[PDB]
Structure 1
Amino acid sequence: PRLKVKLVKSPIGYPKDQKAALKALGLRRLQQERVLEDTPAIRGNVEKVAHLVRVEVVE
């Protein structure tokens, strides 16, 4: 499926790798959504920053 992604927490203070995972999804600011196809890689980063971001499975 596709994945509406809602950045819902600041990345400050978290390790730079997790931030780069945010950049991999293109998420740049708070309250930023991005519907992105549920791929094992993209879902990889998404799982990596699940605590920082909201995942809403969309089409």
Structure 2
Amino acid sequence: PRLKVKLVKSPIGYPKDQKAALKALGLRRLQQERVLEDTPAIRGNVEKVAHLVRVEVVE
């Protein structure tokens, strides 16, 4: 179970903890995608800023 993550919006003006989640996922630029293994320890990260991001399901 893998998930290709694609950022949709910029993190400007949003609280700092959400920025720390974006850094935990390793998002330093816009539109960058990354396929990550599906575990709740990483899914709970994306659940926070889900409104700024998009996720695709792979394998």
Task: Work out whether the TM-score is over 0.5.
Answer: yes
User: Highest CA radius of gyration, 1 or 2?
Assistant: 2
The alpha-carbon deviation at position 11 of structure 1 amounts to 0.4
Partner of 1:19, secondary structure, is: helix
| Alpha-carbon distance between aligned partners in 2 of 1:28 and 1:58, rounded to the nearest angstrom | 23
Unpaired runs of 5+ residues, structure 1, are: none
- Return the structure number with greater helix share: 2
The alpha-carbon deviation at position 48 of structure 1 amounts to 1.0
**Consecutive aligned runs of 4 or more in structure 1 exceeding 2 Å deviation:** none
Q: What are the superposed Cα offsets for residues 1-59 of structure 1, whole Å, 9 maximum, x if unpaired? A: 11100011000011111111111111111110000011101000011110111111112
Tell me if 1:33 matches 2:33: yes
Unpaired runs of 5+ residues, structure 2, are: none
Number of matched pairs:
59
TM-score (norm 2): 0.92
TM-score (norm 1): 0.92
Percent of aligned pairs sharing the same letter: 100
| Alpha-carbon distance between aligned partners in 2 of 1:56 and 1:28, rounded to the nearest angstrom | 19
